[PDB]
Amino acid sequence: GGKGKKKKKRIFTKPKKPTHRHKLEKMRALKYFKVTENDDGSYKVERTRQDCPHPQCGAGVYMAQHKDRQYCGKCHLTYK
Amino acid sequence: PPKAGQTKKAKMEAANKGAKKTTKKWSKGQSREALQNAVMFDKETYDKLRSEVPKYKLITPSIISDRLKIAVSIAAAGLKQLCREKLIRLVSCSSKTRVYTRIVQ
RNA sequence: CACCAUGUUCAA
RNA sequence: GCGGGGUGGAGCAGCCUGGAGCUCGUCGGGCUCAUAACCCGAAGAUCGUCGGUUCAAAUCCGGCCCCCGCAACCA
RNA sequence: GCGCGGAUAGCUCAGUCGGUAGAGCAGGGGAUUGAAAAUCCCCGUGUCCUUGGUUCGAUUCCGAGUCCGCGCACCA
RNA sequence: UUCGCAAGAGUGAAACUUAAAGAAAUUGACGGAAUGGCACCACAAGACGUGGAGCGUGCGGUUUAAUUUGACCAACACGGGGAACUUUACCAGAUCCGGACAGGAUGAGAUUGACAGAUUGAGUGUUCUUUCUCGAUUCCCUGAAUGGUGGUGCAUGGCCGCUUAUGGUCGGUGGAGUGAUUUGUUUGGUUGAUUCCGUCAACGGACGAGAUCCAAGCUGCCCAGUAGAAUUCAGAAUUGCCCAUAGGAUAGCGCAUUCGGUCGAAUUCUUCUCUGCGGGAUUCCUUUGUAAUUGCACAAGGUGAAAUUUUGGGCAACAGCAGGUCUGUGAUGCUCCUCAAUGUUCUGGGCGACACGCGCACUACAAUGUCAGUGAGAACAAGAAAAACGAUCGAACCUACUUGAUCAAAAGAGUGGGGAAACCCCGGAAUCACAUAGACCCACUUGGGACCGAGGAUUGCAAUUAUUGGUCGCGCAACGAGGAAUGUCUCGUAGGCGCAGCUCAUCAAACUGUGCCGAUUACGUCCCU
RNA sequence: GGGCGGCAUAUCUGUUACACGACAACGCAGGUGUCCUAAGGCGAGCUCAGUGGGAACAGAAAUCUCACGUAGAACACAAG
RNA sequence: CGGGUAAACGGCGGGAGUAACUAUGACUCUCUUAAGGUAGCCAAAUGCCUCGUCUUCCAAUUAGAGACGCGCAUGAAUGGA
Numbered sequence A: 001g002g003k004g005k006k007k008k009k010r011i012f013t014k015p016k017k018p019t020h021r022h023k024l025e026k027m028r029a030l031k032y033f034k035v036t037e038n039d040d041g042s043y044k045v046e047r048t049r050q051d052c053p054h055p056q057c058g059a060g061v062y063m064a065q066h067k068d069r070q071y072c073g074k075c076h077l078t079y080k
Numbered sequence B: 001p002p003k004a005g006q007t008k009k010a011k012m013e014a015a016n017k018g019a020k021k022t023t024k025k026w027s028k029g030q031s032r033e034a035l036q037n038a039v040m041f042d043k044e045t046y047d048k049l050r051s052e053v054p055k056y057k058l059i060t061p062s063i064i065s066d067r068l069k070i071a072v073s074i075a076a077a078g079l080k081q082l083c084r085e086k087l088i089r090l091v092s093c094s095s096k097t098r099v100y101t102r103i104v105q
Numbered sequence C: 001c002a003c004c005a006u007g008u009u010c011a012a
Numbered sequence D: 001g002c003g004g005g006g007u008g009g010a011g012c013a014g015c016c017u018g019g020a021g022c023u024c025g026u027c028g029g030g031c032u033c034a035u036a037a038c039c040c041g042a043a044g045a046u047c048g049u050c051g052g053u054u055c056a057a058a059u060c061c062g063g064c065c066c067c068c069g070c071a072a073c074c075a
Numbered sequence E: 001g002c003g004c005g006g007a008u009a010g011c012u013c014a015g016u017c018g019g020u021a022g023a024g025c026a027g028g029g030g031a032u033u034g035a036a037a038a039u040c041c042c043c044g045u046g047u048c049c050u051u052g053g054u055u056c057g058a059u060u061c062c063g064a065g066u067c068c069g070c071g072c073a074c075c076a
Numbered sequence F: 001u002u003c004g005c006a007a008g009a010g011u012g013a014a015a016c017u018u019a020a021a022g023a024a025a026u027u028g029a030c031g032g033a034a035u036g037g038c039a040c041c042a043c044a045a046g047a048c049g050u051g052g053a054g055c056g057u058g059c060g061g062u063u064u065a066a067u068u069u070g071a072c073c074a075a076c077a078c079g080g081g082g083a084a085c086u087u088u089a090c091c092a093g094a095u096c097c098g099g100a101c102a103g104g105a106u107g108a109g110a111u112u113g114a115c116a117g118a119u120u121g122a123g124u125g126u127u128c129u130u131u132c133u134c135g136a137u138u139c140c141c142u143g144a145a146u147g148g149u150g151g152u153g154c155a156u157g158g159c160c161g162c163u164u165a166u167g168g169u170c171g172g173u174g175g176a177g178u179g180a181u182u183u184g185u186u187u188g189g190u191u192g193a194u195u196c197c198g199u200c201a202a203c204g205g206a207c208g209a210g211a212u213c214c215a216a217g218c219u220g221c222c223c224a225g226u227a228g229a230a231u232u233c234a235g236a237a238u239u240g241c242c243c244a245u246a247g248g249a250u251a252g253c254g255c256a257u258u259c260g261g262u263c264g265a266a267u268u269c270u271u272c273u274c275u276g277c278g279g280g281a282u283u284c285c286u287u288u289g290u291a292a293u294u295g296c297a298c299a300a301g302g303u304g305a306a307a308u309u310u311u312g313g314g315c316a317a318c319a320g321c322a323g324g325u326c327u328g329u330g331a332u333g334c335u336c337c338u339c340a341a342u343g344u345u346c347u348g349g350g351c352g353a354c355a356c357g358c359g360c361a362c363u364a365c366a367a368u369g370u371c372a373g374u375g376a377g378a379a380c381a382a383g384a385a386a387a388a389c390g391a392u393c394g395a396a397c398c399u400a401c402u403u404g405a406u407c408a409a410a411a412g413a414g415u416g417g418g419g420a421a422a423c424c425c426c427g428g429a430a431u432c433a434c435a436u437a438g439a440c441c442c443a444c445u446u447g448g449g450a451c452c453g454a455g456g457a458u459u460g461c462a463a464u465u466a467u468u469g470g471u472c473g474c475g476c477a478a479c480g481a482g483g484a485a486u487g488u489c490u491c492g493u494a495g496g497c498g499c500a501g502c503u504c505a506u507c508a509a510a511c512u513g514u515g516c517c518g519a520u521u522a523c524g525u526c527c528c529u
Numbered sequence G: 001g002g003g004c005g006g007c008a009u010a011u012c013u014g015u016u017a018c019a020c021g022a023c024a025a026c027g028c029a030g031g032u033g034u035c036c037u038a039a040g041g042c043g044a045g046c047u048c049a050g051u052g053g054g055a056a057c058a059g060a061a062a063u064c065u066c067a068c069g070u071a072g073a074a075c076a077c078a079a080g
Numbered sequence H: 001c002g003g004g005u006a007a008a009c010g011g012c013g014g015g016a017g018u019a020a021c022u023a024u025g026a027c028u029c030u031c032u033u034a035a036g037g038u039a040g041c042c043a044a045a046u047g048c049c050u051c052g053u054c055u056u057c058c059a060a061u062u063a064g065a066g067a068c069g070c071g072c073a074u075g076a077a078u079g080g081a
């Protein structure tokens, strides 16, 4: 039939898929914490993000927040 | 490969379309007449077996079928009966073949 | 002592 | 004006109602290293075309279209 | 001078007189080759000659033709 | 131009064209030239087929998105090539980088990975929206590099096939030629044999042949609790008068036979079996044979298990082929693609697609048979798993027994055994046999199963393009012995008949072996090749 | 004109032919020299060519059946 | 009936395909005779078409000559050249 390993040069109908680039969020840890002020002058900080409950999934690691769900990067568990 | 010279696709196609049937029958054959052999005994045929079949020097199911125009299956059945009544005697016997002959005197 | 014609071009 | 002929792809019988034959060609398989020759098989017909007769038309009777002959003299 | 027959792809030649464009060769690209010839496969073709009646429409039916073939044109 | 009746004879150029044309010898190759031998990949005498039918399979064509491709005696059940996915090299699409390293631009936010919705063939983070996780491993671009069943076997290595199954091949020194070259290596007889004897401008050697090696047959030592046998005690069975529904032929004329579950003991032994070294066979023996006029040998018979390479294989020189393989390899030079790749994965399809032609098989066309019973009976062989997973064994692998079964097959289960002379296994193979008093009775028929329908089970992640069994239907599909042609074969052979291994999760019409039943013909020839 | 051709030289039907009979041409369209022992003679039964509905193989067309059917068939050969 | 005899009278074919540009047809097929026209010669005092086609001769050539040959219908003592 066709020539052995000859370049095809086939037309493309679908648009080319771009490579996925990691979208960088500046100063991420500033967003995971809200700084409070106490009357003695000392500052107390508590995280505004949930922690993934499973000990295997990142003891001391955070958990995301979307309008419809709440999931984590490691444990991959989602709450709706 | 022996690619034929000047052979077309139209030449190819016309070759296979005309290659169906036609050439056959390399043997003469020489057909035969059917054998009309009765599968059951008639009155006159059964009378012949009880009288004419004895005093035959050589008796065989295929021979009796050739005389009385009957099947060998019932020709052998009658011969086994004639032995039960000692009218004929059995000289050679096996599962597939039986040979009988007439009794002396 | 029947009949027995032929083999594209260069180069291994 | 007179006489003859169109039949498988080629050439030609049959043209003596009821049918298409011969040689070559084509196709398939053999032989051969291969082709030809040779061997074993096969297929292929509006019998020019339009009508008529006949139970039935290559085949008989008319028209047409071509092809080939013979005549076209005395002024 | 007259009558008849041809002008279809790049060339040649088919085409139910009214729906047909069949091809071969010449080309471009592949198969085969150690490279070629040759062979095979796939692709580009076209009314002729000019007016009419246009069958619903014309190489195909008529008129003109060109442009080429083929015949034939006192009398004594 | 001269001569001739003519035919011609004498004399006799040029233009142009061309790198050789010729001569004699040498070595090959060839001959429808001669001589002597040999081979059933040759014939003769034959056997059994193939060519005709159906079907399996390979090859070509046709078709196709693709139907991947090599090969055309020495291609065509060949590439161990029996492809559902993989393999797989082809087609339609989607991922990954498995672009190391070096130099630059970013950078402790370089990057990696992702649930939900939709993009999609994909509850495929491929991409996108939205964020979390990761962490200096990576991304961006320039060179480079790697990988490829990409090309080229006409660039090669290695291996294989073939020339080429026959008896062939090559130095040294000496002789002969100016030389290629020749002699040795030659003729005569013999032999499968350049095998020997003899002769000799050759003498000494080397390789191939032979020898060696592996299996068969006969046999020695050894040997058994992974092979067996014979006795003796016990325990059980038959036990004599018996004449078949017609019942022939075929051994028996101190103690009658059986009983691998009677899972009984004791004793003895190596007749069968296992096998590492041996023995044995070589023209050994004899012809008032052939030949001998020395010899080398040969033919019949003998001895013998075996009587002429004992039989069957393995190995096999030197010269080659543009033979096959770059689709075996981390064998490889050059060249091609290289981030929407000719790399690599994943999904699906294809390799199977059918007016046809060909090679090789399978099954047949029936009575020297088909069915349904019953009997006796081989050999070679294969059998399970890790640095994984469970608690050093235990599960994969093969089986036997039981059950399913208070009712089809194929199944499905449980138990036990086997690492394989230990279990399978006393290996109940099929040809075969049966005086089976069985059915069929010459017909496309109870021959022949192609083709097709419905149920069910099993293998697998997946069965549609039936994977494979089993059940009932179809059988009105050809086929009644095959034209011209053509293959293989000399004795445990052909032909027939099964069995195992191999491919293998499932699947032999294949191959590689194995045993079983077992002939006809020839003991030649150079007519064909 | 004659020759070549044909035959209009013996003869039949239709038309020319002019509604009695008769009527020419090398006028038109065709025939004749044969054929039949039944294709002659007679008597009796029947109805034809075609259509339509229906009936296995069977279809446009094979044979059976029922209707309609003034001749649209046949009467050896041309025609009336 | 059977032989001989043509320097006796005389006679001496047709169709189709085919060469790597295209013509053409050495070649082949087929039907056929008693034999299928040979050597020669030719639009010849013999060629219809025809005033054939080319060359030459002229300012101009139905004429002349030389060529060609599918030759209505040339041709060998019906003697050919």
Ligand SMILES: [K+]
Binding pocket: C006
């Ligand atoms: K030739």
Ligand SMILES: [K+]
Binding pocket: F024
């Ligand atoms: K010479």
Ligand SMILES: [K+]
Binding pocket: F041
């Ligand atoms: K061979």
Ligand SMILES: [K+]
Binding pocket: none
């Ligand atoms: K194929």
Ligand SMILES: [K+]
Binding pocket: none
């Ligand atoms: K692969």
Ligand SMILES: [K+]
Binding pocket: none
């Ligand atoms: K090689």
Ligand SMILES: [K+]
Binding pocket: F164, F166, F167, F168
């Ligand atoms: K040799």
Ligand SMILES: [K+]
Binding pocket: none
């Ligand atoms: K010398």
Ligand SMILES: [K+]
Binding pocket: F191
């Ligand atoms: K010998």
Ligand SMILES: [K+]
Binding pocket: none
């Ligand atoms: K070898």
Ligand SMILES: [K+]
Binding pocket: none
């Ligand atoms: K070699």
Ligand SMILES: [K+]
Binding pocket: none
């Ligand atoms: K009558």
Ligand SMILES: [K+]
Binding pocket: none
């Ligand atoms: K005359």
Ligand SMILES: [K+]
Binding pocket: H058
């Ligand atoms: K003049």
Ligand SMILES: [Mg+2]
Binding pocket: none
């Ligand atoms: Mg042979």
Ligand SMILES: [Mg+2]
Binding pocket: none
């Ligand atoms: Mg066959």
